[PDB]
Design an enzyme around this catalytic site. Structure first.
Site, short mmCIF file in Angstrom:
data_model
loop_
_atom_site.label_atom_id
_atom_site.label_comp_id
_atom_site.label_asym_id
_atom_site.label_seq_id
_atom_site.Cartn_x
_atom_site.Cartn_y
_atom_site.Cartn_z
N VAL A 60 -5.60 -7.71 -1.11
CA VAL A 60 -5.64 -9.00 -0.42
C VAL A 60 -4.81 -8.97 0.85
O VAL A 60 -5.04 -9.74 1.77
CB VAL A 60 -5.10 -10.11 -1.33
N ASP A 61 -3.82 -8.09 0.87
CA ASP A 61 -2.91 -7.95 2.01
C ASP A 61 -3.63 -7.43 3.26
O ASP A 61 -3.15 -7.62 4.38
CB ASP A 61 -1.77 -7.01 1.65
#
Length: 79
Positions: A60-61
């Site tokens: 997700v980063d």
């Protein structure tokens, strides 16, 4: 300026997405690779929760740092 601009911006999304999308990627690989070594002992019910939290925490980063690098990069393509 007009020249170092594309350098800063481009390098911005390259350093940002590179270090981010890959920072998280590699991490998930490092943290995740070792995470299992410990979770293997315990059932796949509890550690699976934290294990995912990390694998995703990384997957997700990138999406953000990447979408951002993509934007700034789009600018490089058209000021």
């Amino acid at each position: 300026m007009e020249n170092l601009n594309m350098d800063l911006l481009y390098m911005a999304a390259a350093v940002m997405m590179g270090l981010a999308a890959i920072g998280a990627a590699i991490g998930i690989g490092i943290l995740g690779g070792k995470f299992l070594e410990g979770a293997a002992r315990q059932p796949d019910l509890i550690p699976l929760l934290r294990t995912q939290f990390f694998i995703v925490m990384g997957l997700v980063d990138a999406i953000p740092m990447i979408a951002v690098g993509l934007g700034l990069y789009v600018m490089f393509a058209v000021a």
